[model samples]
Target: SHMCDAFVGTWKLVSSENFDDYMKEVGVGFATRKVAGMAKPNMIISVNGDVITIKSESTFKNTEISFILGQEFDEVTADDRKVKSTITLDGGVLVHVQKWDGKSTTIKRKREDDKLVVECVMKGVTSTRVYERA
Candidate 1:
């Protein structure tokens, strides 16, 4: 019901690349990286008024974040890192940026040909995760 209406739906992750290396670049421990790598998460996206919520549900762990577009918020990342995060919808893509511990990362999620493609980048290591409608 808002800027990201096109992305509101249940999406199941179908594939991932370089996720372990991407997690490692963000200082996530090996054990956690292993657990995260093995999980195929589902993303539930919804919007109420101006607040957009994205929920990642998986057997390994569950995480959710709700925020207004262009708002900066405190977020506890999946790997358990505390960071400042902001997500902006630009040209139909959600550009999410986070900063913590003197480091930064950018994640972009876009709808491409009936698929949700997410690109994650940190310290030159980039990973791509693709999701399909569930």
Candidate 2:
């Protein structure tokens, strides 16, 4: 599939099995994580050729992310940590090379059983999060 073709749609986070652990790995506070874990987030992914935009909308807070596929750019890490990333693909999975400060991080995403599964690896911590179609 083309990079743009794979992610041009809306998705919702129904229930996360291990999203709390994923948030914890990203240094989210206990209280915040608890609330965030239960949030029903709506994700909108838009792709214009190599340029991609994503929005995670929720009642508490909304986050927007934009990047160029296969091109390196600076990314805002969780907790305001600065990072750089280049996104690409492996088969049907979207892969990201996240460089925080000087260290490297990796995140991957793919569709499984009609659900999107995201695997994030940063600072030696790895976690998987799943989302469903709206």
Best by lDDT: 1
Ten consecutive residues with minimal summed lDDT in candidate 2?
1-10
**lDDT values, one for every candidate:** 0.94, 0.74
Q: Which stretches of candidate 1 lie over 4 Å from their true place?
A: none
What value of lDDT does candidate 1 attain over all alpha carbons? 0.94
| Tens-digit per-residue lDDT, 1-134, candidate 2 | 36656566788876556566766766679888877766788878888766788788887668777887688887675345677778887787889887764667687878777787777776656777777878
Q: RMSD (Cα, Å) of candidate 1?
A: 0.9
Q: List the residue pairs that clash in candidate 2.
A: none
Assess every candidate by TM-score: 0.97, 0.79
TM-score of 2: 0.79
